[PDB]
Amino acid sequence: NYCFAGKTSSISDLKEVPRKNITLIRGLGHGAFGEVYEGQVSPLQVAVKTLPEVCSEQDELDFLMEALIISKFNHQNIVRCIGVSLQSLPRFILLELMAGGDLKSFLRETRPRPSQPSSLAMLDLLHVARDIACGCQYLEENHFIHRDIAARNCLLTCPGPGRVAKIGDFGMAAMLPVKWMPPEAFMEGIFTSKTDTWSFGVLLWEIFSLGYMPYPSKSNQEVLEFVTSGGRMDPPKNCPGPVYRIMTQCWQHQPEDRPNFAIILERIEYCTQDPDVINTALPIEY
Numbered sequence: 001n002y003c004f005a006g007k008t009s010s011i012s013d014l015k016e017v018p019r020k021n022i023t024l025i026r027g028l029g030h031g032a033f034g035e036v037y038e039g040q041v042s043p044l045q046v047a048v049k050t051l052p053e054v055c056s057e058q059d060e061l062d063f064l065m066e067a068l069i070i071s072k073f074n075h076q077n078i079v080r081c082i083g084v085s086l087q088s089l090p091r092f093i094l095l096e097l098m099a100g101g102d103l104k105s106f107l108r109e110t111r112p113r114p115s116q117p118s119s120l121a122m123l124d125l126l127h128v129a130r131d132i133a134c135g136c137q138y139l140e141e142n143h144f145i146h147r148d149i150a151a152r153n154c155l156l157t158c159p160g161p162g163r164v165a166k167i168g169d170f171g172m173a174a175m176l177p178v179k180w181m182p183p184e185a186f187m188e189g190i191f192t193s194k195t196d197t198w199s200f201g202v203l204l205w206e207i208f209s210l211g212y213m214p215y216p217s218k219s220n221q222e223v224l225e226f227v228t229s230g231g232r233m234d235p236p237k238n239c240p241g242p243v244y245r246i247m248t249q250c251w252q253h254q255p256e257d258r259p260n261f262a263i264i265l266e267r268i269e270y271c272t273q274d275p276d277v278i279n280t281a282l283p284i285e286y
């Protein structure tokens, strides 16, 4: 059913892994349609999205569709799909296991504290953002629009240095993520790649505040009105001007005025080269 990079594909095109080759190990949390587990294949370590046996037809198709989409990507900042197990119940989608967990947790559990005073530096944050901008770039030059670029949808391979960040859910592509959306998206329902640009800008704020909820204190409707009136979040605490400057460029009201990801990428690179930026200390939370 699904078309990408030119090629058209279908369920026949997914790697069916024999169920007997799949061991579940522990649960990791819950995604859209159910608990995700840590698991194995034969020795291969994976995450296992599962579909609850008692679910709707549309549930069946959303689940299959997530597999097709994520299976056609080939980029190192987009989580890999090992295969599926769709011919035994409950259904499985096997994905690259990201030991560092999701980005919003990582940021929160790694905030520098008086004991972990050097858990992270500004340069770790810029690499996480480089990683994701690189993924979003790959999507843009393939005309794919993600629609939900947010910290909760990103993942890290490992906790320590050497960690690579990747876009790890494609569920979108009052439940609406208003706080990540540009005016023309929540008003006119128009999406283009300039809307992932806006979202990325908000992700950048999440990254540099260390996992805070955007527009702290505002409900969905207040954000919608704030944002359409020209309102914009302040710099996260300690955020360097040049990094904030990328945020406010991503949030330009006119889609045509926002940068594309090649340009965002250049500017994260320049930030990364600037001693004034990366010699900046993160807030040690007490």
Ligand SMILES: COc1cc(N2CCC(N3CCN(C)CC3)CC2)ccc1Nc1ncc(Cl)c(Nc2ccccc2S(=O)(=O)C(C)C)n1
Binding pocket: 028, 029, 030, 031, 032, 036, 038, 047, 079, 095, 096, 097, 098, 099, 100, 101, 102, 105, 152, 153, 154, 155, 168, 169
């Ligand atoms: C060891 O591997 C993981 C650990 C965690 N966590 C979650 C937070 C938890 N802390 C414990 C302490 N608490 C105080 C706070 C919570 C630490 C470990 C989260 C994710 C992973 N790995 C992983 N890889 C690929 C996918 Cl594909 C996926 N997907 C996945 C895993 C879990 C839930 C949802 C999805 S998802 O695919 O639907 C998407 C939303 C990322 N998760």
